[PDB]
Specification:
about 130 residues, mainly beta, 1 helix, signaling protein, FKBP-like, alpha-beta
């Protein structure tokens, strides 16, 4: 909708500046490096709780190629890399892995050193880890 889902369970650490809470378990294996991922997501700045991104509202999921993602999605990518297909989770990303020191001027307007929250659901990836 627009409200960042409340989820009490304690997070799993994926990186120094990245952690995750699973909302809905998915299936299949985690994606491999360089995998193409299709996903929906909402993004909120942690300190004002402003929603500056919502792919569900704009009916436009994105294509994220792990290893070639834009810098502002570095943290998100790290979270995605830990998800299964169809999984839905909250991803806490330190600003270092987001819009960094300066933030962003507009579209979107993200304050400097602004930690972010992501509610991401992976539609699926094209290459998965096969033992």
């Amino acid at each position: 909708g627009n409200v960042p889902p409340k989820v009490d369970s304690e997070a799993e650490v994926l990186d120094e500046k990245v952690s995750k809470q699973i909302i809905k378990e998915g299936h299949g294996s985690k994606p491999s490096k360089y995998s193409t991922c299709f996903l929906h997501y909402r993004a909120w700045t942690k300190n004002s709780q402003h929603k500056f991104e919502d792919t569900w509202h704009e009916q436009q999921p994105i294509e994220l190629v792990l290893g070639k993602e834009k810098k502002e999605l570095a943290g998100l990518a790290i979270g995605v890399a830990s998800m299964k297909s169809g999984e839905r989770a909250l991803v806490h990303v330190g600003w270092e892995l987001a819009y960094g020191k300066e933030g962003n001027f507009s579209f979107p307007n993200v304050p400097p050193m602004a930690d972010l929250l992501y509610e991401v659901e992976v539609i699926g990836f094209d290459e998965t880890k096969e033992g």
